């Protein structure tokens, strides 16, 4: 009886196995745009993905991860609120059963259809597993998805999903360029938070871009054909794999922009 996104094992249950679920810096949160404070001391983000080396795509039973070679500084995030260099390890999405839900963060209570998370770890800690034990161990770049025009740079992802329909399946996924998933603007909000999936560790500097990307209805429909279940098990569509907004508590959300 493992955690998931159902009635009997979903986010309201996670605290029993992971009591940090009720902690002081949990994610996601609602971003109240009027009370976020512009911080003129924040820097432009530096997103340096030209040398990224994607390797594989995996259905892990909760989402799918596009995995990168993080054994050198190839794809790194720096600047903004961050001190030092954070290496891209994977990206994944959260999405809904319907276009009106799916994002983890919300903006003035608005839910987007989906949310992309590019996960990076602080190189000063040597490996991901050590980084997640530190309050500044990870930086996640979060990007909202709305349904409208297709995102050309997403289509290669979409088209491999039939090969990883069920939990535990992977496929080679080399030469994918994550620059094709970014919006035009790097304006962002930032706050200290957590993993949004168990173990919910409080190790993340969240950087949530203001500008959503647009994806087509057909693209998101293909996300919704994935399965939470393994092969040869009754079908459970992989939809609504998002944690809702958590209490902000003693945190301030900062804006990079006026
Ligand atoms: N949703 S999230 O907080 O970006 C997040 C998710 C996962 C996961 O694969 O479930 C991992 Cl390992 C790290 C992070 Cl930081
Ligand atoms: Zn995520």
Protein model, in words:
The chain is mainly beta. It is 7% helix and 29% strand. It has 3 helices and 15 strands. The strands form 2 sheets. Strands 2, 3, 4, 5, 6, 7, 9, 10, 11, 12, 13, 14 and 15 form a 13-stranded mixed sheet that branches. Strands 1-8 form a two-stranded parallel ribbon. The protein starts with 29 loop residues before the first strand and ends with a strand. The relative contact order is 0.24. The structure holds 2,4-dichloro-5-sulfamoylbenzoic acid (V8I) and zinc ion.
Condensed summary:
7% of the residues lie in helices and 29% in strands. It is mainly beta. It has one domain (2-258): Carbonic Anhydrase II (Roll), CATH 3.10.200.10.
The largest sheet is: 13 strands, mixed
CATH architecture: Roll
**CATH homologous superfamily heading:** Alpha carbonic anhydrase
What structural class do the secondary elements suggest? mainly beta
What are the secondary-structure elements, in order, as H or E?
A: EEEEEEEEEHEHEEEEHE
Total tally of structural domains: 1
Tally of contiguous helical segments: 3
| Percentage of residues in helical conformation | under 10%
CATH third-level topology: Carbonic Anhydrase II
End-to-end Cα distance: 47 Å
Bound molecules: 2,4-dichloro-5-sulfamoylbenzoic acid, zinc ion
Content of β-strand: 25-35%
Q: What is the name of the CATH class?
A: Alpha Beta
Shape: globular
Rg, alpha carbons:
17 Å
How many strand elements?
15
